[PDB]
Structures are given as structure tokens and as C-alpha cells.
Design a protein around this nucleic acid. Structure first.
Length: 49
DNA sequence: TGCACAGGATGTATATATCTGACACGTGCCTGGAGACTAGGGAGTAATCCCCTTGGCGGTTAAAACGCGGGGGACAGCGCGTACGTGCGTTTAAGCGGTGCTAGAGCTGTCTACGACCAATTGAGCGGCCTCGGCACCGGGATTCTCCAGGGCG
């Protein structure tokens, strides 16, 4: 359920990590970019889907 | 001579007998009130089936919702003048009293077409079905149609 996603964002934001969320509420243009951004070497530890 | 008075000669509200109009009461013939027989139309039930819901997750889209620029159109202010508002005298014609009529309005027998009421047939009209040619939606392309920037012109 999507109601866990916002709570998980408030948690990951509480502990201060670098994350990116991908779900049905995003657009098509921000999808592939958030993908390649995670695949390439970066500081993002967790990727929410 | 100038003056007050006693009585007639006219008004005038005042009180009395008199003329319509409308409320009030006493009838009798077309109405209602009521009694009995028929019966089909209304109250009641047994499936039924059939479309209409129950509850809520997500993903995504098209429609709803908000936000700012400003352009033009609503809108306040104000002067003008002629178009009705207001006030006179002069006229044509309706109101109304009264009249001689009639021709059409209005209540009543005859019968006779002629439509109300009831069996027998059916065929034209209604439930069921399954197709295809007209219809729905959109590309291609030409056509028009409005928006904006000089500039030749004030």
C-alpha cells in the first residue's frame, strides 16, 4: 500500500539518508532519471519502490 | 331733519310623511335518501428473475482547481435641450331618461337514424432475431482568419 511510503519517507528523512521514491504517483519523465541516477555510482543508499 | 321701531317679505335648517331595495319567511315538484340484486373489479398471495449492489486497495488519465497580467468595459461625474409635466379655455360626444320593435333566444313533442351492447374470424400488428451499410472518428491538405510589427503617414 502507498500509505506506508510517506511514513517511510518521514523515517528515512528522520535518520537522514539519501533516497528516491518510485511509485504510481510519479511521472514518466522523473522515472528513467531516478533510475539511471541510482544505477550510476552515487551516494543514495536506499531506493523506495 | 336724523333716528329707532313694529311689522311684513322673504330663507333655512328642522321635522314629518313618503318612495326603492334588500333581508326575512311560507310553499311544493324535481331533486335526494334509501332498500334489494347482481358481479366483475379490487384486495391478497406464490414464485420469480433480474438488474442492481458491497468494500476497498493500486495506477493512470482527463477534468477540476488555483494564480497572475492587464485590457477593455462597467461605471461615476457633468453639461445640454427638447420633450413631456403642468396649467388654462374651448368642443364633441358619452350618460342617461325615455320609446317602438322584433328576431333571435329559449323550453317542449316525434321518430328515426343510429350508435350502444354482444358472438365469430383473423390478419395486421407485436415479441424475437440477425445481419451490413450507413455512421463515428480522425488524417491530409487547402483555405481562411485573426494577431502583431513597421512606416508612411499624420
Amino acid at each position: 500500500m502507498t500509505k506506508v511510503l510517506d511514513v517511510l519517507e518521514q523515517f528515512l528523512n528522520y535518520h537522514g539518508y539519501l533516497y528516491m521514491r518510485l511509485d504510481g504517483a510519479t511521472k514518466i519523465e522523473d522515472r528513467q532519471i531516478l533510475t539511471e541516477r541510482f544505477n550510476t555510482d552515487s551516494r543514495i543508499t536506499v531506493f523506495i519502490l
